Amino acid sequence: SHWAQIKHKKAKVDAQRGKLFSKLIREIIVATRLGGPNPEFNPRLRTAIEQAKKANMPWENIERAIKKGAGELEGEQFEEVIYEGYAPGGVAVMVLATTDNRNRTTSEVRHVFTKHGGNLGASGCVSYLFERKGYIEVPAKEVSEEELLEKAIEVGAEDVQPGEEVHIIYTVPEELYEVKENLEKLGVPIEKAQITWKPISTVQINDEETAQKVIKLLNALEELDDVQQVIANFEIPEEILQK
């Protein structure tokens, strides 16, 4: 279950909503800038819109976000940037950010890494330790380990890992939406469907001291509005101590 920690079905559907919506708004903006404001020719946008609706984000905010990503070109500038660096214990970290000011975000990220004993590196310092994959989340509460494990295989997934709160399904990146579609067509609810990076191997970290620094670093990166996803290749002995 190495990092699938939303604590138990989302982090907080009350105090944390502004932050979550801010990130959903960014995804709609970038999906729009990347494949157009017309969802019919934009599967990513179709999915971003759906996730926003599922999270109870006002439809007026969803519409506003699409106009911002399309009415783009001067007066915005949101782009996706990938940061790569190392946390203590030799743990590799990729950070997927969507920002309107790269220099600003880079400094915020660099500060976070340094504060926690890590080090932001240059483009390419860790990506060879990960692979780009489709990532699908399905609510544990609503399905079963057994039924889901079978359906994942039935649709033809790359990798599956049960969860206490969420089950995770990985796919070939180009087949992310095809798999999502086939899973919903079989009755499986989808909580999230997005492109992510998956470690090709993990780094075992047994020093409880080091483990805590790694986790605080990752948590700190998550607290940045500019950050969409944080991925690391650590391997920690079943520990819930902290976020």
In total, the chain counts a number of residues equal to 243
Render 95-152 in DSSP notation, one character per residue: EEEEES-HHHHHHHHHHHHHHTT-EE--TTSSGGGEEEEEEEEEEGGGS-HHHHHHHH
Q: From residue 78, how far is each of 5, 48, 158, 223, 226 by CA, in Å? A: 28, 16, 31, 18, 10
What CA–CA distance (Å, rounded) separates 194 from 30?
Answer: 13
Sheet with 119-120, edge to edge strand ranges = 119-120, 79-87, 91-99, 227-232
Is the alpha carbon torsion for 78, 79, 80, 86 positive or negative? Answer: negative
Environment class of 106 (CB within 10 Å of its CB; exposed 0-12, middle 13-18, buried 19+): middle
Residue 112: other Cβ atoms inside 10 A: 24
Cβ neighbours of residue 124 under 8 Å, at least 6 residues apart?
Answer: 84
**Parallel, antiparallel, or unpaired for β 234-235 and 203-204?**
parallel
Query: What resolution in angstrom units was achieved for this structure?
Result: 1.7
3-state secondary structure of 243: coil
Residue 149 carries which side chain, given as an amino acid letter?
A: L
| Beta carbons of 133 and 197 less than 8 angstroms apart | yes
Environment class of 82 (CB within 10 Å of its CB; exposed 0-12, middle 13-18, buried 19+): middle
Lookup result for tokens 């439809």: 59
3-state secondary structure of 85: strand
The Cβ-side half-sphere exposure at 94, using a 13 Å CA radius, reads: 22
Structure tokens at 9: 């079905």
List, in order of start, the domains of the chain with CATH numbers.
Answer: 14-77 (1.10.10.200), 78-128+202-243 (3.30.70.980), 129-201 (3.30.70.980)
What CA–CA distance (Å, rounded) separates 208 from 86?
Answer: 17
Q: How was this structure determined?
A: X-ray
